[PDB]
Design a binder for this molecule. Structure first.
Ligand SMILES: [Fe+2]
Length: 186
């Protein structure tokens, strides 16, 4: 039974329930993420920005079944073109806007990567990506407003691949956290 999360903590409890089995209902997860209304007071603990690039801040480990984390994007910060290691990935905006660009999996030949589409994700919107759909890049193109987003990955993964736009070549990347449970990482 899907109910509206009243708070971030409530969202987390609902997610534990949803992920209690070994099979995940993606539509239900997206729906509950969208129904959570961003309340900056509830996630301030996790919103730790960096001057130079975006930060990843772990919120919950999902009793093993998922990682839930908050990403903080300064003006002009963006990500690489990346995959998600055969996991489910959900992204919800908690503050500001992000441009999401979708790319096709590259061919064998070196070649400018092909942009499928792009869209602006606005506050409280929740999107879904998985490798079968394609690859993506996420960016805060604003010059005046920092952005904050909530991400959920299941199963959790800490390694993925980044892709070069000019050539399609991929490189392995290990994901790092800037903070976990509100505490900065060494
Ligand atoms: Fe992503």
């Amino acid at each position: 039974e899907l109910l509206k999360p009243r708070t971030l903590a409530d969202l987390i409890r609902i997610l534990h329930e949803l992920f209690a089995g070994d099979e995940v209902n993606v539509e239900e997860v997206q729906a509950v993420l969208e129904a959570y209304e961003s309340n900056p007071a509830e996630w301030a603990l996790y919103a730790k920005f960096d001057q130079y690039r975006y930060t990843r801040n772990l919120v919950d480990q999902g009793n093993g079944k998922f990682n839930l984390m908050i990403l903080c994007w300064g003006e002009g910060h963006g990500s690489s073109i990346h995959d998600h290691t055969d996991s489910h990935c959900f992204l919800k905006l908690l503050q500001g806007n992000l441009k999401e660009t979708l790319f096709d999996w590259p061919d064998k030949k070196s070649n400018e990567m092909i942009k499928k589409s792009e869209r602006t994700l606005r506050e409280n919107q929740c999107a879904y990506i998985n490798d079968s759909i394609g690859l993506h890049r996420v960016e805060n193109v604003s010059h005046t407003e920092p952005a904050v987003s909530l991400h959920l990955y299941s199963p959790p993964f800490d390694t993925c691949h980044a892709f070069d736009q000019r050539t399609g070549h991929k490189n392995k990347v290990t994901m790092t956290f800037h903070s976990k449970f509100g505490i900065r990482t060494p």
